[PDB]
Amino acid sequence: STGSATTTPIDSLDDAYITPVQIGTPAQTLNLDFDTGSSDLWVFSSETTASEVDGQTIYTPSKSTTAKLLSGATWSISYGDGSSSSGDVYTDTVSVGGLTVTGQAVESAKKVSSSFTEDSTIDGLLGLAFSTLNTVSPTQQKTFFDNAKASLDSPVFTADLGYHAPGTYNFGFIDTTAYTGSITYTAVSTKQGFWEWTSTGYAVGSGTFKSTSIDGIADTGTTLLYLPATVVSAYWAQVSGAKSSSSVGGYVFPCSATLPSFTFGVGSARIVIPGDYIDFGPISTGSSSCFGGIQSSAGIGINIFGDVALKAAFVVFNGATTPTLGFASK
């Protein structure tokens, strides 16, 4: 089997991407944030505290003839940005882009943190990291991909995120028309539960490539590119007037600037992030200070190849017995 679904930016900055997911019978379609940095499929629901729902579409398990309470199971998750959610668990039929999994754990939120409530466009998350990170207790549950894998034509999924435009998540096949050149594959460590890999270096604009190992995670659920402070300083030094602002929470730059590209290495291959992809717009409405899309990972404890980086590539998440990542230009 295969599946293919379009993923759509939630706003004009590409802060996140939403993908429609069919849950239950008859289907209830929710728009979920596909997150290769976590491993829970959780949704706003009829059980979510009413004051914490503000415009989201909810899953109502009592209206699904295939829903079953997973007795005794609870979940609770905290994300790298300080947000969180928790609740109980149903199993139900879940379909993405025509690919169907029966008995998928659907984690129904009883509580969500304010950042989720305040974002009416995201109805929940669909985790695509390794199932060892799933938070369901006392019986850990499998991700949608883990449940589907054995049925897929090939045990892979691909992320093709758009810049200020829709893109595609495919399951079970490589669309050879979706990228240019060849796909370069690179080793993955699953020891922390992530799609963790080592970039071979970077360049700023037309500058020379610096060969240096940068361990990080491929994380579709993180907006920005978080890299070591040395690398980030080297980038922003090429933007007149850019500076790190402790009060804003990162590097800012004059909105009048033209940003240089940023290149990262995948083996001997190179992925070029155009400068425009690094512009996240005014820090507040009407400001001439703009927020940068490359930020320091100091204090986060891991480097993160978030959407800023991934949207510049066609990315293969190869879930074979020994997982690997692939990157191609597009």
Spatial distance between the Cα atoms of 74 and 60, rounded to a whole number of angstroms: 17
Closest CA to 104 of 76, 53, 64: 64
- Neighbouring-strand partners of residue 243: 252
Alpha-carbon dihedral angle through residues 48, 167, 184, 238, given to the nearest 10 degrees: -90
Answer yes or no: are the C-beta atoms of 9 and 1 closer than 8 Å.
Answer: no
Q: Residue 230: which H helix or E strand, with range?
A: helix 229-236
**Residue 278, C-beta contacts closer than 8 angstroms, at least 6 positions apart:** 225, 259, 262, 292, 293, 294, 308
Residue carrying the six token digits 């499998």: 142
**Residue showing tokens 């986060």:** 300
Amino acid sitting at position 228? P
As a whole number of angstroms, the longest Cα–Cα distance in the chain is 60
d(CA 143, CA 281): 34
Residue 154, token pair as written in the block: 């090939």
Reference 316, options 308, 328, 304; nearest CA is 328
Residues annotated as catalytic are 35, 199
Amino acid present at 204: V
